[PDB]
Structure formats: structure tokens, C-alpha cells
């Protein structure tokens with residue numbers, strides 16, 4: 001629906017936006033750092049479905065936080081659960097400030113990657129959980145499908161892929177304030193299936209203010 005005229009401007013505009021964003025939890029969420037406690041706890045519950053003892057138990061050795069920010073999700077959610085954690089982001093400033101935000105537990109952060117997801121290729125057979133939260137709006141429909149295709153080959157046995165992002169009620173919403181596109185459940189599930197991934201669980205985050213978009217979590221492998 002003519003979402004992006006010249007995809008180059010899409011990435012360039014968004015990248016410039018986040019360079020001038022304060023490396024605070026409030027800055028990571030566009031001024032909504034007060035919901036970080038709600039998100040983490042529901043992510044904690046949604047993740048236990050595959051961490052609790054069962055038929056195909058997901059490992060606890062390594063995880064990959066995409067987007068990752070200054071390490072908001074890394075610190076509260078991933079780091080307490082997994083041995084080592086990797087992070088990937090396009091804004092170098094956030095990864096530098098992460099070392100102080102994470103602090104003592106940030107020493108177990110194994111790798112810091114500074115590049116865009118459209119160019120990032122995770123190492124194969126490396127991660128048990130690949131967390132992707134609130135970043136998919138900055139990728140094109142084709143790059144998001146190509147990226148998920150690469151993440152499938154980087155998963156360890158029983159590893160999963162988690163996507164937690166904003167979903168529109170009707171239509172594609174272009175949010176030019178940060179150069180991001182918001183999709184509905186249909187377009188997202190088409191891209192997920194187009195990468196060769198299976199839907200394991202789908203849950204909607206509740207207890208969230210009505211002003212923000214609807215938030216859904218997908219479990220893939």
C-alpha cells in the first residue's frame with residue numbers, strides 16, 4: 001500500500017531518530033518507561049511455557065536480545081534466566097550505555113553487535129531464545145521475512161523465536177514520527193509463515209493503556 005518510497009530513506013530516517021534519543025528506559029519506550037514492569041512480568045510468564053519441564057524443553061544456555069536498547073529486556077528478563085546473553089542494535093550509543101545500565105550482571109553479556117537487523121546474520125546453532133521486541137516496525141516486509149529465515153538456522157535444538165510488537169486494529173499505520181510501520185495480525189502472520197516458521201503460541205499483552213497500540217507475542221521455531 002505504498003508504505004515506503006525508496007526503502008533507503010526508511011532506514012536512514014529511523015536511524016537518525018534513535019541517535020538523538022536519551023539512553024533511558026523511558027526513552028526506549030517513547031516515554032512509557034512506567035510499563036516496563038508490566039511487560040517484563042508478562043514476558044516472564046509467556047516464556048515459562050517453553051522453559052518449564054516438558055516434551056521439548058527450551059535451553060537456558062544462551063539468548064539473543066534483538067533491538068535490546070540499553071538492555072531493558074536483557075537485564076530484567078533474559079539475564080536472570082540464561083547463562084550468556086547477546087545483544088544486537090543499530091545505535092552504538094545505546095550499547096555503550098548498556099554496560100552501566102546492566103552493570104555487574106552485564107559482564108555475562110557475551111557479545112554486543114552494532115548493525116541493523118536487515119544486515120545482521122546470527123551465528124548458527126547458537127541461541128536457545130531469540131527475543132525480538134518493538135523493532136519489527138522499522139524493517140520492510142521482505143527484510144523482516146529474510147531476517148526470520150536467518151534466525152531459524154541460528155536456533156539450537158528446541159530453540160524458539162519470540163516476537164512482541166505492536167499490532168494495528170485495521171490497516172497499516174505509518175508512524176512517521178519515528179519512521180516505523182505498524183502492521184495488523186494478518187500481515188505479520190503471513191510474513192512469519194513465509195519464513196518457514198511454525199506458530200507455537202499467541203498471546204495479547206493486557207493491563208496496557210488504551211492510547212498505545214495493541215501488543216501481541218508470538219512463539220516461533
Ligand SMILES: CC(C)(NC(=O)O[C@@H]1CN2CCC1CC2)c1csc(-c2ccc(F)cc2)n1
Pocket residue numbers: 028029030032134135136137138165166175177178180181211212213215
Ligand atoms: C508503548 C508502545 C508499545 N506504544 C506507543 O506508545 O506508541 C507510540 C506511537 N508512536 C509514537 C510513540 C510510540 C511509538 C510510536 C511503544 C513505545 S515505543 C514503540 C515502538 C513500536 C514499534 C517500533 F518499530 C518502534 C517503537 N511502541
Ligand SMILES: Nc1ncnc2c1ncn2[C@@H]1O[C@H](CSCC[C@H](N)C(=O)O)[C@@H](O)[C@H]1O
Pocket residue numbers: 011014018028029066067068069070071072073074088089090091094115116117118133134135138139
Ligand atoms: N532497522 C533497525 N535494525 C536494528 N535495530 C533497530 C532498527 N531500527 C530501530 N532499531 C532499534 O530498536 C529500538 C527501538 S525501541 C527499543 C526496544 C527495545 N528492544 C527494548 O528493550 O524494549 C532502538 O533501540 C533502535 O536502536
